[PDB]
Amino acid sequence: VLSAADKTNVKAAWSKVGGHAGEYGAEALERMFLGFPTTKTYFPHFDLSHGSAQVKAHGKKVGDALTLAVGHLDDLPGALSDLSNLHAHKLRVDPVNFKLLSHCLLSTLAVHLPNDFTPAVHASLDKFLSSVSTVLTSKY
Amino acid sequence: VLSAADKTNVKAAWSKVGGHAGEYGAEALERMFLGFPTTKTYFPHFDLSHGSAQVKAHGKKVGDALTLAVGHLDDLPGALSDLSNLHAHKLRVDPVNFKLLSHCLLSTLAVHLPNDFTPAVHASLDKFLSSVSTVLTSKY
Amino acid sequence: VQLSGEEKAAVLALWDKVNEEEVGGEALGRLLVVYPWTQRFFDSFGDLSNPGAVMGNPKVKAHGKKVLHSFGEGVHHLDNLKGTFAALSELHCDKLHVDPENFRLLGNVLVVVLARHFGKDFTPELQASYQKVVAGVANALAHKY
Amino acid sequence: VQLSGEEKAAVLALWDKVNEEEVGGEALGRLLVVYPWTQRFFDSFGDLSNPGAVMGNPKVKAHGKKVLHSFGEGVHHLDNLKGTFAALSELHCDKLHVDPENFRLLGNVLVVVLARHFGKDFTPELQASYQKVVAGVANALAHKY
Ligand code: HEM
Ligand code: HEM
Ligand code: HEM
Ligand code: HEM
């Protein structure tokens, strides 16, 4: 998201995600923990095993928040201000980890929506996720 | 720049740079070319030797543009729109190179203003240069 | 670079099924579309204006295939990555001047493409092993910089 | 990692003049102020709320000195960086879980601090050599990841 064409692509792609945002959210977190073990450090209080109820629940929160942003592309800093504070001031999440979760989310979308995950859509989704990441690290 | 305190720090620091912005601009480019030889690729048409007239002239352009931005912190995308197009669409500058020039500019400021280059000022200058870099790569 | 025995076997089993031409062309094409500053290095390939022009360009497909073939060599030589890519490292640094961050980008794009082609077979555990390979290759190509 | 003879001599001559305590404390302090997500790793150091609290904290100065001493070892062992830092690599990956990008950040901060302390003596050519050392150290600490 940023340009009109990207906003169109992003709203369109996420309509195909639909009710599965929570499921994909959880799968992406799993891919992240396994592929990039450094990230487990932020989740000491979670059972990190496959099909964990906490990971499932937290995946639902991530999916809902991305759904939030898709409907507020014209003002991401306003819509996601509560989360900027949580991730940057309270949790002090290393900005590199946002790039890793983004990659894992794109990977998860490719698995489940191979025909819809075209080069043009992949490009707009990448910009969208980078814009979300900037907002969440904006206190930095 | 971003928060009020950072904008204050940045305007204050640049007032100490003053008429030297062009000189520091040129020195920073020199440090960049030598420390990070990949960057020379964007300047085939320049004499890159020390005290080159082209490097001196181009340093003056970079310094003037940063001076431009300092006076337009509330609207960087508007003030620097001509340059976004040049660097991203025409020149296709790899975004990594902005991080390298920023580092070299901070290094140059440390050399020349050691008493003014305090931790708080260094932090605000880093955010400012990152904000300028984002604007210049925004077409991406 | 360092897998377990089970992990190597899984990595290798997937590779038997990789069409280096379809995957290579797709991976390179996506890199050029998603990170469009990479297009500067491929000026000689002609029209790269829009996603349609990129994905159908014969020079993109042909060069993609060559990239994937070279990846395949790394996959079959996991204990000697640095020696396998020493000549290619030199080429990218000395002649081409490619920033090494771009090797990680292409590696990740390739993982996304594998995910697209194999779907649910490209499990979280298998991607984890592929992230290791991808990073090993990127590090071996960066070595002579 | 690989300097010329003239470059090594210049790197080493500057190091004779480096106060590992003043430089170390300053470098670590700036890292914590400029990239404040790094503060998560140093929770045990107490109050790191503001630049004043950081730069005057005794645990920051003491740990900074230790970092710079370890850097000094790399400077005096430029041909064997990976062996010199093998134990420290293990510590940062296995025990501390520090992302390797942060090693490049600290390296660059250290270069900025050297520039501040030495002024015009820290020439463009000398910084260029230091960028090589800094990158060599960062790569050696990343090796066991
Ligand atoms: C696309 C970017 C991200 C989004 C949209 C996002 C979304 C969220 C949301 C909505 C919450 C609030 C949950 C609640 O109120 O209970 C949260 C919390 C949290 N996030 Fe993120 N997040 C993102 C990136 C990251 C990354 C990269 C990390 C680090 C690996 C991270 C670590 C955490 C942690 C540790 C919590 C608190 C969990 C708890 O204690 O229950 N987040 N995130
Ligand atoms: C702080 C960020 C930067 C600023 C403020 C900046 C500023 C400028 C300005 C004002 C110009 C226009 C000169 C004119 O109209 O003649 C320019 C051009 C140019 N810039 Fe940048 N620049 C930045 C970063 C970079 C980087 C990182 C590179 C790549 C190493 C780069 C490469 C170029 C090139 C190749 C030109 C055209 C030079 C010519 O042909 O005369 N710039 N820049
Ligand atoms: C995964 C990492 C990469 C691998 C394994 C790889 C592999 C290769 C191979 C096998 C060649 C052919 C050399 C020959 O003919 O002997 C090549 C050339 C080339 N590569 Fe890469 N490459 C990688 C990354 C990149 C990236 C990220 C770029 C973008 C800058 C790049 C730009 C080029 C260019 C411009 C050529 C010359 C093409 C020509 O003949 O015009 N490479 N690479
Ligand atoms: C230039 C690269 C670095 C070098 C040379 C270095 C060096 C060291 C040294 C010498 C120690 C002492 C270990 C011992 O007592 O045997 C240490 C520990 C430690 N390092 Fe680093 N370090 C580097 C980068 C980093 C970075 C970027 C971080 C930020 C995450 C970090 C976080 C830590 C922490 C949290 C400890 C343990 C401190 C304690 O005792 O509580 N290090 N490092």
Side-chain angles (χ1 to χ4, degrees), chain A residues 1-138 140, chain B residues 1-138 140, chain C, chain D:
Chain A
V1 302
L2 227 80
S3 93
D6 288 316
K7 302 180 176 168
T8 300
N9 290 172
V10 168
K11 299 185 177 191
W14 215 253
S15 80
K16 280 117 184 177
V17 168
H20 295 292
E23 298 188 336
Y24 300 165
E27 184 179 334
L29 289 165
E30 176 168 31
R31 283 178 187 275
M32 188 186 63
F33 299 139
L34 256 4
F36 308 98
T38 339
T39 59
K40 300 196 283 187
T41 304
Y42 290 92
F43 296 90
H45 52 304
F46 275 26
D47 189 298
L48 259 17
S49 69
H50 175 271
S52 168
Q54 283 170 290
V55 176
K56 205 183 195 78
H58 189 65
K60 192 75 218 75
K61 299 288 219 166
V62 180
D64 284 355
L66 293 166
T67 305
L68 193 272
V70 175
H72 299 93
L73 299 169
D74 291 352
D75 186 34
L76 284 184
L80 296 177
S81 186
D82 69 307
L83 277 344
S84 300
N85 205 266
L86 174 65
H87 294 86
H89 181 79
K90 181 174 194 284
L91 302 171
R92 299 180 304 286
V93 176
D94 185 329
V96 178
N97 297 315
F98 293 86
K99 286 174 191 199
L100 307 172
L101 183 51
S102 302
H103 168 67
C104 287
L105 199 55
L106 293 175
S107 297
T108 300
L109 271 16
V111 164
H112 292 281
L113 306 170
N115 290 306
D116 301 295
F117 196 72
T118 64
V121 160
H122 175 177
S124 302
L125 266 39
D126 182 72
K127 291 172 194 170
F128 163 68
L129 292 168
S130 300
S131 294
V132 169
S133 290
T134 303
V135 165
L136 292 184
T137 59
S138 70
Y140 286 148
Chain B
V1 302
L2 227 80
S3 93
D6 288 316
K7 302 180 176 168
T8 300
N9 290 172
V10 168
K11 299 185 177 191
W14 215 253
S15 80
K16 280 117 184 177
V17 168
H20 295 292
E23 298 188 336
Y24 300 165
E27 184 179 334
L29 289 165
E30 176 168 31
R31 283 178 187 275
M32 188 186 63
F33 299 139
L34 256 4
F36 308 98
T38 339
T39 59
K40 300 196 283 187
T41 304
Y42 290 92
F43 296 90
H45 52 304
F46 275 26
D47 189 298
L48 259 17
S49 69
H50 175 271
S52 168
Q54 283 170 290
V55 176
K56 205 183 195 78
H58 189 65
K60 192 75 218 75
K61 299 288 219 166
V62 180
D64 284 355
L66 293 166
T67 305
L68 193 272
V70 175
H72 299 93
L73 299 169
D74 291 352
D75 186 34
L76 284 184
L80 296 177
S81 186
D82 69 307
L83 277 344
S84 300
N85 205 266
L86 174 65
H87 294 86
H89 181 79
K90 181 174 194 284
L91 302 171
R92 299 180 304 286
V93 176
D94 185 329
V96 178
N97 297 315
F98 293 86
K99 286 174 191 199
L100 307 172
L101 183 51
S102 302
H103 168 67
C104 287
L105 199 55
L106 293 175
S107 297
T108 300
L109 271 16
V111 164
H112 292 281
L113 306 170
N115 290 306
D116 301 295
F117 196 72
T118 64
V121 160
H122 175 177
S124 302
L125 266 39
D126 182 72
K127 291 172 194 170
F128 163 68
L129 292 168
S130 300
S131 294
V132 169
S133 290
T134 303
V135 165
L136 292 184
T137 59
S138 70
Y140 286 148
Chain C
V1 59
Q2 7 235 315
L3 301 311
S4 80
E6 287 275 58
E7 277 193 286
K8 277 189 201 281
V11 167
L12 291 163
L14 185 71
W15 205 260
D16 278 345
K17 301 175 174 298
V18 170
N19 179 331
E20 292 178 351
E21 153 178 64
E22 283 179 40
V23 177
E26 189 182 329
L28 210 201
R30 288 174 184 264
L31 177 89
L32 293 172
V33 172
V34 181
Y35 313 103
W37 63 80
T38 63
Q39 296 173 18
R40 203 184 72 87
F41 296 92
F42 299 97
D43 259 316
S44 69
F45 283 22
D47 190 29
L48 312 169
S49 300
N50 56 71
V54 176
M55 313 298 311
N57 183 309
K59 295 288 189 55
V60 174
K61 295 185 171 70
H63 186 70
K65 178 172 183 154
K66 303 318 158 313
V67 174
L68 258 282
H69 190 79
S70 180
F71 254 100
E73 280 284 315
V75 173
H76 293 115
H77 296 274
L78 290 170
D79 301 331
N80 191 200
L81 262 21
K82 299 209 172 168
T84 301
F85 292 95
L88 281 169
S89 188
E90 167 159 77
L91 177 77
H92 294 86
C93 174
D94 293 341
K95 195 220 160 65
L96 304 176
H97 310 281
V98 176
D99 192 284
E101 216 281 318
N102 295 298
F103 308 144
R104 178 161 174 67
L105 288 187
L106 180 50
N108 283 348
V109 170
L110 168 59
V111 166
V112 169
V113 174
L114 293 170
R116 204 189 70 81
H117 285 264
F118 288 102
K120 296 152 195 267
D121 291 337
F122 199 71
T123 67
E125 292 76 11
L126 189 52
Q127 167 165 3
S129 298
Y130 270 92
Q131 299 294 163
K132 301 182 193 271
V133 176
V134 140
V137 173
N139 290 331
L141 285 165
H143 180 86
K144 311 216 170 205
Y145 270 82
Chain D
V1 59
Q2 7 235 315
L3 301 311
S4 80
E6 287 275 58
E7 277 193 286
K8 277 189 201 281
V11 167
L12 291 163
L14 185 71
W15 205 260
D16 278 345
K17 301 175 174 298
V18 170
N19 179 331
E20 292 178 351
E21 153 178 64
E22 283 179 40
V23 177
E26 189 182 329
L28 210 201
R30 288 174 184 264
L31 177 89
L32 293 172
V33 172
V34 181
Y35 313 103
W37 63 80
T38 63
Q39 296 173 18
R40 203 184 72 87
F41 296 92
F42 299 97
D43 259 316
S44 69
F45 283 22
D47 190 29
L48 312 169
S49 300
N50 56 71
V54 176
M55 313 298 311
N57 183 309
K59 295 288 189 55
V60 174
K61 295 185 171 70
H63 186 70
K65 178 172 183 154
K66 303 318 158 313
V67 174
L68 258 282
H69 190 79
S70 180
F71 254 100
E73 280 284 315
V75 173
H76 293 115
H77 296 274
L78 290 170
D79 301 331
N80 191 200
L81 262 21
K82 299 209 172 168
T84 301
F85 292 95
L88 281 169
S89 188
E90 167 159 77
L91 177 77
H92 294 86
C93 174
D94 293 341
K95 195 220 160 65
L96 304 176
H97 310 281
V98 176
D99 192 284
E101 216 281 318
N102 295 298
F103 308 144
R104 178 161 174 67
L105 288 187
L106 180 50
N108 283 348
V109 170
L110 168 59
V111 166
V112 169
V113 174
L114 293 170
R116 204 189 70 81
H117 285 264
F118 288 102
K120 296 152 195 267
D121 291 337
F122 199 71
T123 67
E125 292 76 11
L126 189 52
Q127 167 165 3
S129 298
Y130 270 92
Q131 299 294 163
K132 301 182 193 271
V133 176
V134 140
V137 173
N139 290 331
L141 285 165
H143 180 86
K144 311 216 170 205
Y145 270 82

